[PDB]
Design a protein around this ligand. Structure first.
Ligand SMILES: [Ca+2]
Ligand SMILES: [Cl-]
Ligand SMILES: [Cl-]
Ligand SMILES: [Cl-]
Ligand code: NI
Ligand code: NI
Lengths: 63, 66, 66, 64
């Protein structure tokens, strides 16, 4: 369906934002000189990205 | 770069990014509402959007801790 | 500052900016239809995309070599 | 409709500032890595191609 196709392209692009943003954090992280608390939050944000990435992959898998 | 400038530049990227993806969440939400009633695709999409709301909360906490 | 550590750094920069290309091409593709582009704006956009595509291939060529 | 040009222009503005920072970083590594001529040349082409890409995107931005 073309409506489903358009939706798929938006989600594909959103997945690109998820993965790309996870790469951004990885690139910027060292220059932050994080303590244990900022690190915990960054890791928590990153794990939440990975869940969202998983759900987006499920959607892209099924159509 | 010193940690000061690092957190500054990342703080900037994070705010733009949160603003940006909130636009896509709203867009995809409205397109998703045009789907058939109780279409299984819709449920997969709501879960993805919900998980993004979690990520927004947690990324905001990062932003505030810089 | 040691040469092997800079080549690793550069590899990370390059893989990352390749993610920026993918994100950006996608960005133009989705936001474009909302533009109601005239042909002139439509021509610049196609031009920027083609230029970005040349850039991706010249970034790959660096990453292939190291 | 025409609000779709204000949204795209905010994107491109942020994007080009963000890209500018990555070209600087790459430029820094090209300099440190100057002893490898061949790789430096590859990097120069790539940075020049991005320079052209950044100008065409800036053109889009102005025309929005
Ligand atoms: Ca993609
Ligand atoms: Cl600290
Ligand atoms: Cl602290
Ligand atoms: Cl503290
Ligand atoms: Ni980046
Ligand atoms: Ni986007």
């Amino acid at each position: 369906e073309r409506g489903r196709k358009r939706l798929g392209i938006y989600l594909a692009h959103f997945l690109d934002h998820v993965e790309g943003h996870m790469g951004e954090i990885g690139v910027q992280r060292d220059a932050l000189a994080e303590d244990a608390r900022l690190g915990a939050l960054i890791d928590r944000a990153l794990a939440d990205m990975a869940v969202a990435r998983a759900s987006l992959n499920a959607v892209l898998r099924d159509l």
